[PDB]
Design a protein around this ligand. Structure first.
Ligand SMILES: Nc1ncnc2c1ncn2[C@@H]1O[C@H](COP(=O)(O)OP(=O)(O)O)[C@@H](O)[C@H]1O
Ligand SMILES: Nc1ncnc2c1ncn2[C@@H]1O[C@H](COP(=O)(O)OP(=O)(O)O)[C@@H](O)[C@H]1O
Ligand SMILES: Nc1ncnc2c1ncn2[C@@H]1O[C@H](COP(=O)(O)OP(=O)(O)O)[C@@H](O)[C@H]1O
Lengths: 742, 493
């Protein structure tokens, strides 16, 4: 079908003017990686770019970043024309020039920093009129080439004399400034971002379709999550990336007025959105406008919600206006909005993970100069509980420390600080550590959902248990048709019973890692808190989360904690039943199998568990976790010690054989104690060495040698003295009797 | 519309209401429809503003004046009967009430048919399965599902096919069909079921599903079928049929199945309340809800009411010895209160089930309440073969098996145990099939044979090997001491 056109889509590379094609297309376009290619674009404009080769991209999709898209006016999903240009001809000093009315912190010689490093080692192709952007001095400035001596385009060569002008020509009105946000300015919310994109891509890019078919599109969307998660940012990014008109409404602005003015402003906003269709309306602080009627007392407060409901009902009749609202939690607002036709569609943003936090740091560290000791992976690992706003604040504070310390001493009297000295300063990881330790009001203490990192090789032994868990979890998701052919419906729910410290908690995360599914863990203290507070409703919310995070795995430990609280095995006057387990059974019975939400429980006192939860339709498969044996103990030792430096004189097999009836926790404690002894010895040796020679005024005396980089059998055998059994043999007999009496 | 009236001032709202009533009067025969009635006239306890109370009196006066003028009829829609004021539910304003409830499998299938008329569908639709798995959804949910299933396919196909070829026309528009995979995606990924409350419907279980218990079948028919079919026979003599029966027996003997088999045989509604619900009522001290249940049974007559785990509360507060106290508790007291004040003519049977009848409060066994007690014993060989045949009539099986031999080899078993045996055998079969298929797929991929298909179902049906393997883990569930206790209770009567 005239294979000249091709769709445009996102690119991974940071550089400008580079298009990555799909490899199976080499000789059809006939151009290799050393040929620059002309791409057409709207309002009769073009660009020229060098090309790369990659496998992952689709056949019909070029990959190219924002700077090379905007001048083409090409918006993602649009189609452009690609044609080879081996006739490239070099230019002689294309004239390049800053854009916009003014540039912050702009003076002096900006060309030796924002031009020459960029053009260097590049041979970047460039067409007259392009908006290629450069970055430095922690600022992103884009320079439009106004004149090219040859035409239409030129390669930049190091032999071209350079032209230092630096005049602020203001930007033309029609183009949308590169200042605006895009899909590349958000990280950690890829799944929900894709959901929204696929949900609202057709009604805006294809409305004539929706008038060509009889179907009902969504006309209301709710986003719920903690503050500082990027909701309004996502809305504005979606609006900018489709050309749809964007309108903003703030709750306090409406609540800071009288009835007439407020209920006029709402209607005028709705009509203005109607006029500029296709358009999107965004509302934030919805709870501030329409909470549940229990918390509303003023009559005007109840009158302002009816107007919104009527407007929402009338929206379905008119135009293509879409409406999005932001809220903290779904239950904080009126249930009358969550109906069919007003706010049917709902979405959760959740929290970023280590990868998400690292991506946010990359977004916020683009224009900042950083040293070679950043190792942002460590920061992401130690950044637990923070969100995007927290990361931005941390980065700003880390920069502020260094700049305020250095500049004040250097330049407060030398001269008016200029761009060169401004950007000469780098950043150092110690500043990040200070800004992360001193200022740590983490704004998160609630539950967490994410794919864990534990793996099978972390687990020592229990291969049969691994197979039996795979058969339960992997098979139903991978191969349903086989279950359909036969009559068995997979049973969802398993119970681990065994001695403490045998690795029960690790398998629940290993399975999720293997299957790449979310995981949730609820500990015994939470159950006891719910019991004491008589707050059973919370249980419901948990399952809702699991419903909206499917496929997912739910974990419960210390399930016998409540039975232990109200007496022991004999117990207080009463029965095995209690409130929270009753609610758990109620929630389990009323849940669909197709949702794919497995349930795991763990305990060491199965006898005092209520039998009602072991019946068919609930936890029905029981697995026993025995104590590690010599072959498993050696594996446990190797797994634990694969992170610390160790010598070779050790005999791990000897240690494993010398231990009988031990637990993984005991061996980990032994390793930690040996490490403690080693660090104590190193500290003592270092301090003694430092103190002894200071009295002797020898300016140069360094016998620098790691006193004990690795541990030997001495420390381990010293730790053997305190190492002893943890679980009594009587408990082992009880567990075996329970495992046989079944 | 309620919000339209509530989004104005007193004068405008109370003028619009009167004008609407007048226009309805002028254009007789006219029907007025009101929705979100609770938004206008809730209970006075939740109303504080004076204007809110002033708007309800106007509606009451208009309703009172309606009777004198014209043929205007008034219909209102609410969520629950108790969410609005009680002064409207009087003689002359809102005397007549109706419940819409929830659609059943047939209703859901009908709704899907209504929503799939003008859409083009493939030959793998099998809407029966979708209706079966669509549990808790309502009409709006089904419409949303159909729209989303269509959207998936159209969006995936059109964007690739026509975004550059040509302005999409009708021919390419309607050339696209729909597939069951799209339905499965739209029903799994998007499953915002908007229903978790109770359910009322005629069950599907039949007598053939039950194994044995023919005398119990006759005794239950005599109790249920005869009163409804032949009232004049009871009138000629002096006996009044007794409503209420209690099943007592060992666990896993089919007690729950008979309550639905009777309803299916008589084509009557059925309601089931489990023990966790009762324990929730007890812990929350929420007894009023009990009343609501009976109200539903009153508006769904003829119907059957079922209670299981009736000894759960007694077990909770100690065992047979129990905590310091008596047999009576709050929920059973309320149940007795509701049972006594119920008319026989409404035809609402009550069934209870238990396995520890000794610790049941005797006040519920008195005449006028549950008084007919039936014992469900462990299945025998003749019954056990029937259970095996009934459960295995839905899976492919071979012929080398000897069902009779398995029946004789089992003694003191329950239906649950045999069902578990069948499930375990099926699990073994599916595991073997998966392993064989994956090994076959992996072995020949290394060998670059573009054409190699020895396609044969590795194990379409099960054989005696798997069944005998599962017989290792199969064992008794109910102790003989329990059967002795049940016989002692059945004799001491
Ligand atoms: N997912 C994210 N990725 C990158 N930055 C984010 C993200 N979420 C929030 N931010 C940061 O938060 C700031 C905006 O906060 P905002 O999302 O408006 O708060 P709220 O969540 O209350 O709407 C931005 O400066 C942005 O850098
Ligand atoms: N099979 C195992 N493989 C490796 N480590 C184990 C294993 N079992 C227990 N451990 C050790 O036990 C510790 C965690 O104990 P945990 O599993 O939480 O106890 P419990 O099973 O009582 O919850 C970890 O530090 C881990 O090193
Ligand atoms: N008479 C019977 N006929 C067929 N199946 C039975 C019978 N009794 C029990 N079952 C089996 O028991 C299971 C349901 O047990 P249930 O009757 O709910 O136990 P309980 O009687 O304790 O309520 C079903 O899967 C069914 O196959």
């Amino acid at each position: 079908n005239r294979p000249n056109r091709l769709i445009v889509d996102e690119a991974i590379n940071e550089d400008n003017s580079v298009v990555s094609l799909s490899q199976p297309k080499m000789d059809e376009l006939q151009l290799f990686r050393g040929d620059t290619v002309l791409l057409k674009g709207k309002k009769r404009r073009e660009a020229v770019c060098i090309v790369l080769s990659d496998d992952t991209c689709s056949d019909e999709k070029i990959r190219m970043n924002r700077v090379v898209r905007n001048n083409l006016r090409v918006r993602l999903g649009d189609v452009i024309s690609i044609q080879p240009c081996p006739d490239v001809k070099y230019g002689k000093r294309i004239h390049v020039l800053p854009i916009d009315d003014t540039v912050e912190g702009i003076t002096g010689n900006l060309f030796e920093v924002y031009l020459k490093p960029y053009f260097l080692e590049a041979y970047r192709p460039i067409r007259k009129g392009d908006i290629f952007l450069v970055r430095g001095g922690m600022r992103a400035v884009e320079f439009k080439v106004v004149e090219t001596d040859p035409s239409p385009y030129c390669i930049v060569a190091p032999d071209t004399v350079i032209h230092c002008e630096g005049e602020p020509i203001k930007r033309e009105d029609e183009e949308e400034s590169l200042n605006e946000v895009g899909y590349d300015d958000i990280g950690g919310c890829r799944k929900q971002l894709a959901q929204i994109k696929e949900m609202v891509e057709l009604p805006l890019r294809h409305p004539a379709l929706f008038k060509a078919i009889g179907v009902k599109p969504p006309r209301g969307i709710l986003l719920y999550g903690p503050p500082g998660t990027g909701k309004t940012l996502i809305a504005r990014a979606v609006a900018n990336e489709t050309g749809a008109f964007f309108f903003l409404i703030n709750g306090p602005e409406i609540m800071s007025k009288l009835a007439g003015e407020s209920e006029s402003n709402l209607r005028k906003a709705f009509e203005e959105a109607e006029k500029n269709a296709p358009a999107i309306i965004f509302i934030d602080e919805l709870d501030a406008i329409a909470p549940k009627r229990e918390k509303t007392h003023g009559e005007v407060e109840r009158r302002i919600v009816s107007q919104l409901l009527t407007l929402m009902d009338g929206l379905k009749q008119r135009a293509h206006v879409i409406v999005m609202a932001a809220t903290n939690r779904p239950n904080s607002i009126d249930p009358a909005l969550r109906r069919f036709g007003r706010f049917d569609r709902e979405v959760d943003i959740g929290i970023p993970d280590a990868t998400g936090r690292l991506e946010i740091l990359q977004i916020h560290t683009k224009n900042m100069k950083l040293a070679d000791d950043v190792d942002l992976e460590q920061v992401a690992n130690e950044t637990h509980g923070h969100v995007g706003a927290d990361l931005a604040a941390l980065c700003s504070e880390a920069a502020l420390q260094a700049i305020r310390k250095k500049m004040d001493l250097i330049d407060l009297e030398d001269e008016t600080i200029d761009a060169e000295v401004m950007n000469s300063l780098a950043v150092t990881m110690d500043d990040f550590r200070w800004a992360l330790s001193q200022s740590n009001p983490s704004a998160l203490r609630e539950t967490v959902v994410e794919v864990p990192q534990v793996t099978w090789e972390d687990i020592g032994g229990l291969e049969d248990v691994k197979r039996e868990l795979q058969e339960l979890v992997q098979y139903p998701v991978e191969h349903p048709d086989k279950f359909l052919k036969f009559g068995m419906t997979p049973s969802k729910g398993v119970l681990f019973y065994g001695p403490p410290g045998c690795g029960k908690t690790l398998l629940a995360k290993a399975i999720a890692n293997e299957c790449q599914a979310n995981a949730i863990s609820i500990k015994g203290p939470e159950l006891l808190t719910m019991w004491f507070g008589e707050s059973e409703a919370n249980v419901r919310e948990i399952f809702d989360k699991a419903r909206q995070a499917a496929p997912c795995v739910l974990f419960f430990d210390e399930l016998d904690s409540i039975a232990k609280a109200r007496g022991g095995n004999i117990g207080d006057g009463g029965g095995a039943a209690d409130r929270v387990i009753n609610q758990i059974l109620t929630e389990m019975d009323g849940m669909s199998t197709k949702k794919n939400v497995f349930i795991i429980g763990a305990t060491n006192r199965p006898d005092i568990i209520d039998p009602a939860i072991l019946r068919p339709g609930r936890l029905d498969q029981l697995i026993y976790i025995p104590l590690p044996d010599e072959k498993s103990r050696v594996a446990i030792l190797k797994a634990n010690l694969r992170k610390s430096p160790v010598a070779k004189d050790v005999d791990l097999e000897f240690l494993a054989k010398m231990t009988n009836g031990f637990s993984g926790a005991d061996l980990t404690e032994i390793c930690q104690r040996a490490c403690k002894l080693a660090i104590r010895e190193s500290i003592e040796s270092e301090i003694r060495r430092e103190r002894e020679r200071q009295t002797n005024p020898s300016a140069m005396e360094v016998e620098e040698d790691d006193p004990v980089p690795e541990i030997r059998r001495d420390h381990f055998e010293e730790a053997m003295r305190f190492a002893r059994r943890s679980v009594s043999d009587n408990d082992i007999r009880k567990y075996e009797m329970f495992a046989q009496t079944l």
